[PDB]
Design an enzyme around this catalytic site. Structure first.
Site, PDB file in Angstrom:
ATOM      1  N   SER A 153      -7.931  -3.425   8.375  1.00 55.33           N
ATOM      2  CA  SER A 153      -7.376  -2.465   8.115  1.00 55.33           C
ATOM      3  C   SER A 153      -5.199  -2.976   7.550  1.00 55.33           C
ATOM      4  O   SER A 153      -5.508  -2.812   9.339  1.00 55.33           O
ATOM      5  CB  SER A 153      -7.391  -1.563   8.731  1.00 55.33           C
ATOM      6  OG  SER A 153      -5.886   0.093   8.352  1.00 55.33           O
ATOM      7  N   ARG A 154      -5.122  -3.825   7.052  1.00 55.68           N
ATOM      8  CA  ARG A 154      -3.235  -3.586   7.300  1.00 55.68           C
ATOM      9  C   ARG A 154      -2.477  -2.884   7.851  1.00 55.68           C
ATOM     10  O   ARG A 154      -1.368  -3.090   8.372  1.00 55.68           O
ATOM     11  CB  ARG A 154      -3.269  -4.175   5.691  1.00 55.68           C
ATOM     12  CG  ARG A 154      -3.782  -5.670   5.231  1.00 55.68           C
ATOM     13  CD  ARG A 154      -3.377  -6.050   4.096  1.00 55.68           C
ATOM     14  NE  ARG A 154      -4.070  -6.858   3.277  1.00 55.68           N
ATOM     15  CZ  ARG A 154      -4.038  -8.313   3.616  1.00 55.68           C
ATOM     16  NH1 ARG A 154      -2.917  -8.650   4.525  1.00 55.68           N
ATOM     17  NH2 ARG A 154      -4.652  -8.834   3.226  1.00 55.68           N
ATOM     18  N   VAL A 155      -2.622  -1.760   7.041  1.00 59.91           N
ATOM     19  CA  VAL A 155      -2.116  -0.037   8.282  1.00 59.91           C
ATOM     20  C   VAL A 155      -3.303  -0.616   9.377  1.00 59.91           C
ATOM     21  O   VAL A 155      -3.808   0.229   9.898  1.00 59.91           O
ATOM     22  CB  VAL A 155      -2.453   0.295   6.998  1.00 59.91           C
ATOM     23  CG1 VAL A 155      -2.054   1.782   7.839  1.00 59.91           C
ATOM     24  CG2 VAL A 155      -1.948   0.730   5.770  1.00 59.91           C
ATOM     25  N   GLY A 156      -2.480  -1.218  10.384  1.00 62.64           N
ATOM     26  CA  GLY A 156      -3.388  -0.891  11.747  1.00 62.64           C
ATOM     27  C   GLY A 156      -2.444  -0.009  12.426  1.00 62.64           C
ATOM     28  O   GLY A 156      -3.107   0.332  13.498  1.00 62.64           O
TER      29      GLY A 156
END
Ligand code: ATP
Ligand code: TRT
Ligand code: MG
Lengths: 526, 170, 487, 124
Positions: free
Chosen positions: A351-354
């Site tokens: 998930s690049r949205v961490g």
């Protein structure tokens, strides 16, 4: 009504048109009403135009009733379906036709929001699974892929992600209630019935509609299933609501686009697909967004499913969707078979949205779990099949992997405390077998409330209106930390003394089976 | 009067949240109020602290969420979701005038335990909670302590000695 | 004078064909039809003549609701794009229509998009160095002016911070603006990149911005994405020629520039040669790169992100891209997790200008000695984890100290993140940097501890930190001594 | 439908139905898809697989055989048959050559009614 021409030829679902003597212009993506009879009509869509005057057309209904020579009338308008809050309870057809079971119109293809009409993702979408919400968290406006072979838990993740959202949306206002749209492409028609019955069983269909394009349906109707679902989600975005949107699945949608494009003699490419099949999914997934405060602050999340074959990711569609998506989830059959369910592979799952999605109480916890599992692999990979390893990392990690195993979603409160116990060492004296029974007693039951230990003013795991203090203050906050530790310490001591002692003494035949079934039930309910 | 406010991208933003607040106070049910913040956002006129607090006033003073009843309804979670929206999503911070509503609900509902968290949090953020509600909260606590309502009954029940899946009620 | 008009005759996806009654316009010529018909403005560029009056044209937007035999206006030329100071701090699509909502753009002239490459005479064979200010780059990987550079980074490796700092430094050091090109960019990253340029003041809306932005997004057809880098590079050739200065050209993944042209060639019907990439692979890629060259009048450098599908370098898209690159700024999550930022792994990187025929001799010998040192440190690192540091000789443990010092000394701060993390940034020159590493290599700065070199710039700057560390520890001793002696 | 009886529908096999239309798709002029199959394979198979289904009136307990050429599951014909089943029984050369019959690979195959609630818990 004034026609444009008459059908000239058909190739299964595909059609062709011959213009009338009164040469009239037809737009490129409009609908064509074919007069199969005096009353019944076969809707269709333009897919190409030609120099001589002709129209290659995809047929969306009543294909068998099509014959050459029929009249063909035009609408002069793009495809559009019914739209609004009067749809959340009902299955549908991507033409909007409600499917039985035992005004406002919206366009199927609209341009996605520009950058200025968007917002960085800030709020979480709780799948109910500790795995996802800890290490590869899903945000709102965060399109995130689900990969895996057949029968791994893909549909189950996207279907439990809906069920978790029922307990909350009842409580919270109807502005922050994330709704949902399941979209079945090329799935068997009975799976849709089982989904209908399941979501109806948990009162999840009041906030969840379904778009059904089965395998018996035309490819052009499978082609537009995700567009129909998205168009339904778009008013919810524009009405400030939050909305989810699932696809089971896109790999079949691409087969349908292949069928259409090849039968209409579009130029082929890799895996016999055309060129703009990357653009096909970009027309769709980019419509997912976390909108701006000038745009109601709504959001459309996406959980596109894509089936792999022999764990291939070099495939064309998988390559493409990974290039498009804001992360990915990767399920594995080698783990699904080994009792690890949901069977993620956390290294390949991203998930690049961490953290921007995670909550205040979640950043600390999951940030510790990353610093636990990244080490657990360097140790677990090098150790033998027979080595005994007594270390805080391998202990805490193995117990955490047991906690990651659960059928069905989990309340947020339940998800945190069970992991706080592990990362801080409270779940170390227990065995790897009895971890889920520890959790079942911790969450649903309350041992210290039973055994008299009541030196805790407020912190107990029976109210379930308490997580809204955890989400706000966070467990690291001074008021929740010691009470949390005390509940966990007392629960741990009472467990390790009363229960974990009786367990190991059950050296019989039927008692151990009576216990094994208990643990494998605790795995399910928790 | 009102200082300037700017969007993320720097565009000017409206502050005249006046009439929308009256639109909230007239909301007979506290789910039509949340449907006003959408119009405020869509008008380039986002909500202020006073606006969120008017919404909490209606979450407390209203009788139900919508016209028809609702399953699993709860006033408290509504309020706290507004607070997590105010603080984390938007950045606006609450005040004493906000936790007041949050505390009055826990007194009316009688959930005395969560009230003490609100008392322990208002005192961590530097807020002076009204002693009237603290006395009422302790009153409900002692009340429930007399009748064994301090905890529910299903938790005080003795645990099964048998490891049968049916005994535990899974 | 009047303007030419044509009529559509067929529409197949993005492809459109346009009949005329006179001489067909040139190839790559733009053809506009008014927004009243489709509902929005619509441009299509001629690609492929079919007869004396037909002109196949690829379409950059959605051709939905486009009737047949609609009028089609010949622009008289190809896609004229804005150019100038007014371009800065803005975003532009392929056609130069701003999409940031921030009002019009006040430009004077408007240049075409497919400019021919510089002639051989305009070139400058003298290979120069771009003083990046990032010592890690300057020492081992000197960015050659007018050259192509590779940037290999996924998530959480400081890719954004690097490109932001490059913009800043080239704006002050070489006095040159920059330009970004998002080819197949996720529309979320456009916001996450346009807003980072507000906190960093690379785009000062109320001041002087530095970079132009060009976002060709995934929601756009390939006829647009294929024609993006020409747009962002046309913005740069104004700064090269008219302003007479040096320029950076950041290119979000070239893989997605190649894929889009593959899609165009498919739609046109051209037989895919290989795995699925167009037959015109190297042509369409080289027509872009050959404009990225130094000149007598300026320079355009291009930092190009490259995606390697399946980690295979033999695929034609990477392989053709590598034949044009000059340096490879690799980024690793490992060094990033080890505290190093910028997260560069110098040994797996490489450059072409590393030759004393190009650069001065000291810069070369020092860098090659560092490569020798860190390579030996990798080998000894494979030995220490097995045997132990006490197993090593007295000569080896010295370089085991100095290599650690070097690797910690590569860690540099950034003025971009000065507000976020608080620490200052350091623009360190080229020659000063070589004397610094030569000191650390000749052993004349060995008494200094290791951590002093962590997150600093220049040998003249660390010594303040070394003094600060010694003073702090001395104060802790003077605190402990008197706190224990008082009792 | 009419008799209301329960029915068994054995099929040997579903794959020859597929390639029978593949042998004609070239003559029809339909552009072939990948590995040499017709573009309308998935739709054509779905129009048949959906007919095989129980109703309120009765129940067809179908059984299907499939040829996996070269033992390659990635062949789109089997892969498209996955969705249209409830018990995806799978057989393997590796178990067969070991002398074990039926040469089932229990890890590569999994059913639908393998649930906790539909069947006995001990079984599961
Ligand atoms: N956490 C879990 N615990 C136990 N069983 C699970 C879990 N998650 C999924 N399953 C099981 O996996 C099976 C398949 O789930 P699902 O249908 O989502 O897989 P799928 O890959 O979508 O299947 P298909 O390939 O047929 O679409 C179900 O029988 C379900 O009970
Ligand atoms: C002598 O000077 C040579 C300078 O060369 C500059 C251009 O270099 C081209 C880059 O070539 C490569 C080679 C390999 C790789 C690897 C294999 C390390 C990339 C990987 C690991 C991502 C597959 C990357 C780039
Ligand atoms: Mg499924």
């Amino acid at each position: 009504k004034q026609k444009i021409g008459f059908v000239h030829g058909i190739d299964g679902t595909i059609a062709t048109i011959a213009p009338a003597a009164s040469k009239v212009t037809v737009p490129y993506n409009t609908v064509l009403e074919i007069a199969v009879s005096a009353t019944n009509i076969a809707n269709a869509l333009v897919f190409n135009l030609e120099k001589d005057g002709s129209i290659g057309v995809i047929l969306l209904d009543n294909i068998s009733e099509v014959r050459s020579g029929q009249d063909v009338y035009a609408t002069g308008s793009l495809l559009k379906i019914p739209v609004g809050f009067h749809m959340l309870g009902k299955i549908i057809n991507p033409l909007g036709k409600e499917i039985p079971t035992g005004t406002k119109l919206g366009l199927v293809e609209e341009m996605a929001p520009n950058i200025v009409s968007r917002q960085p993702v800030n709020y979480n979408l709780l799948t109910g699974y500790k795995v996802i919400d800890t290490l590869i968290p899903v945000g709102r406006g965060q399109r995130e892929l689900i990969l895996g072979d057949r029968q791994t838990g893909k549909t189950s993740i996207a279907l439990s992600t809906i069920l978790n959202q029922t307990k909350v949306n009842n409580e919270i206002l109807s502005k922050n209630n994330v709704l949902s749209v399941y979209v079945s492409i090329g799935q068997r028609c009975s799976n849709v019935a089982r989904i209908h019955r399941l979501l109806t069983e948990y009162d999840a269909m009041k906030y969840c509609t379904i778009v059904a394009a089965t395998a018996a349906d035309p490819a052009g109707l499978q082609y537009l299933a995700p567009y129909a679902g998205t168009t339904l989600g778009e008013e919810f975005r524009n009405s400030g609501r939050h909305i989810l949107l699932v696809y089971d699945d896109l790999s079949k949608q691409a087969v349908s686009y292949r069928q259409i494009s090849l039968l209409l003699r579009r130029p082929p490419g890799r895996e016999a697909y055309p060129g703009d099949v990357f653009y096909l999914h970009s027309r769709l997934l980019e419509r997912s967004a976390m909108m701006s405060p000038q745009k109601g602050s709504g959001s459309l999340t996406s959980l596109p499913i894509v089936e792999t074959l022999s764990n291939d990711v070099t495939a064309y569609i998988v390559t493409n969707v990974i290039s498009i998506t804001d992360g990915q989830i990767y399920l594995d059959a080698k783990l699904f078979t080994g009792g690890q369910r949901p069977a993620v592979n956390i290294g390949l799952s991203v998930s690049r949205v961490g953290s921007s999605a995670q909550n205040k109480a979640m950043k600390k916890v999951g940030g510790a779990l990353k610093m636990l599992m990244g080490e657990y692999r360097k140790m677990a990979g090098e150790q033998t099949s027979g080595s005994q390893n007594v270390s805080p990392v391998m202990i805490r990690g193995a117990r955490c992997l047991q906690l990651f195993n659960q059928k069905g979603p989990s309340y947020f409160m339940d998800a945190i405390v069970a992991l706080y116990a592990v990362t801080n060492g409270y779940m170390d004296d227990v065995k790897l077998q009895y971890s889920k029974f520890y959790e079942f007693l911790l969450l649903n039951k309350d041992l210290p409330v039973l055994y008299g230990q009541v030196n805790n003013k407020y912190f107990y795991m029976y109210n379930k209106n308490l997580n809204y203090f955890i989400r706000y203050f966070g467990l690291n906050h001074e008021i929740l930390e010691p009470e949390l530790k005390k509940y966990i310490e007392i629960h741990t001591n009472l467990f390790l003394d009363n229960y974990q002692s009786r367990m190991n003494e059950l050296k019989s035949d039927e008692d151990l089976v009576q216990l094994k079934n208990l643990l494998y039930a605790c795995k399910r309910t928790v | 009067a009102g200082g300037k406010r700017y969007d993320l991208f720097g565009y000017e933003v409206s502050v005249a949240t006046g009439p929308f607040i009256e639109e909230i106070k007239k909301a007979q049910f506290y789910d039509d109020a949340g449907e006003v913040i959408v119009k405020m956002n869509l008008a380039n006129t986002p909500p202020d602290l006073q606006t969120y607090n008017a919404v909490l006033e209606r979450i407390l003073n209203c009788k139900s969420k919508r016209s028809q009843p609702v399953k699993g309804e709860n006033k408290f979670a509504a309020m706290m979701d507004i607070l997590e929206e105010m603080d984390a999503r938007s950045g606006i911070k609450p005040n004493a005038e906000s936790w007041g509503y949050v505390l009055k609900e826990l007194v009316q509902a009688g959930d005395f335990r969560l009230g003490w968290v609100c008392i322990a949090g208002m005192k961590s953020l530097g807020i002076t909670p009204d002693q009237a509600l603290v006395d009422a909260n302790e009153a409900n606590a002692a009340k429930a302590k007399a009748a064994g309502t301090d905890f529910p009954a299903y938790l005080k029940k003795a645990a099964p000695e048998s490891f049968d899946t049916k005994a535990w009620g899974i | 004078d009047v303007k030419q008009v044509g009529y559509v005759q067929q529409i197949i996806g993005a492809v459109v064909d346009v009949t005329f009654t006179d001489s067909v316009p040139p190839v790559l010529t733009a053809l506009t039809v008014d927004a009243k018909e489709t509902g929005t403005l619509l441009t299509m560029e001629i690609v492929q003549h079919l007869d004396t009056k037909t002109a196949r044209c690829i379409c950059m937007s959605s051709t939905d609701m486009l009737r047949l035999r609609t009028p089609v206006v010949n622009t008289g030329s190809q896609i004229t794009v804005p150019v100038g100071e007014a371009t800065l701090g803005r975003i532009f699509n392929v056609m130069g229509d701003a999409i940031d909502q921030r009002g019009p753009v006040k430009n004077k002239v408007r240049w075409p998009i497919h400019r021919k490459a510089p002639t051989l005479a305009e070139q400058s064979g003298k290979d120069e160095v771009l003083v990046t200010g990032i010592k890690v780059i300057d020492l081992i990987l000197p960015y050659c002016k007018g050259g192509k550079i590779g940037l290999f980074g996924g998530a959480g490796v400081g890719k954004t911070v690097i490109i932001m700092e490059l913009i800043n430094n080239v704006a002050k050091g070489h006095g040159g603006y920059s330009v970004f090109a998002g080819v197949g960019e996720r529309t979320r990253e456009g916001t996450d990149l346009y807003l980072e340029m507000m906190g960093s003041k690379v785009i000062d809306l109320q001041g002087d911005s530095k970079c132009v932005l060009v976002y060709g997004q995934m929601n756009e057809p390939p006829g647009a994405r294929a024609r993006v880098a020409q747009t962002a590079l046309t913005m740069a050739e104004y700064f090269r020629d008219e302003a007479g200065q040096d320029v950076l050209l950041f290119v979000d993944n070239v893989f997605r520039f190649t894929q889009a042209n593959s899609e165009v060639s498919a739609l046109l019907g051209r037989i895919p040669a290989a795995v699925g990439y167009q037959p015109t692979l190297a042509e369409d890629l080289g027509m872009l790169q050959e404009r990225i060259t130094s000149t007598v009048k300026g320079s355009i450098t291009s930092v190009q992100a490259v995606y390697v599908p399946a980690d295979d370098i033999t695929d034609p898209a990477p392989a053709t891209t590598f034949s044009h690159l000059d340096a490879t700024t690799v980024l690793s999550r490992s060094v990033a997790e080890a505290g190093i930022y910028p997260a560069v792994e110098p040994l797996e990187c490489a450059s072409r200008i590393m030759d004393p025929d190009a650069i001065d001799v000291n810069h070369y010998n020092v860098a090659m000695d560092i490569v020798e040192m860190l390579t030996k440190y990798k080998e000894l690192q494979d030995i220490i984890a097995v045997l132990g540091i006490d197993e090593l000789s007295e000569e080896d443990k010295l370089i085991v100290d100095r290599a650690r010092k070097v690797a910690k000394f590569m860690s540099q701060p950034f003025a971009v993140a000065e507000v976020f993390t608080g620490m200052k940034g350091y623009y360190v020159q080229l020659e000063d940097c070589v004397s610094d590493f030569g000191s650390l290599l000749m052993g004349q700065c060995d008494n200094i501890p290791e951590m002093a070199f962590y997150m600093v710039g220049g040998l003249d700057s660390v010594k303040e930190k070394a003094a600060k560390m010694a003073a702090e520890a001395a104060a802790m001793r003077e605190r402990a001594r008197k706190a224990a002696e008082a009792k």
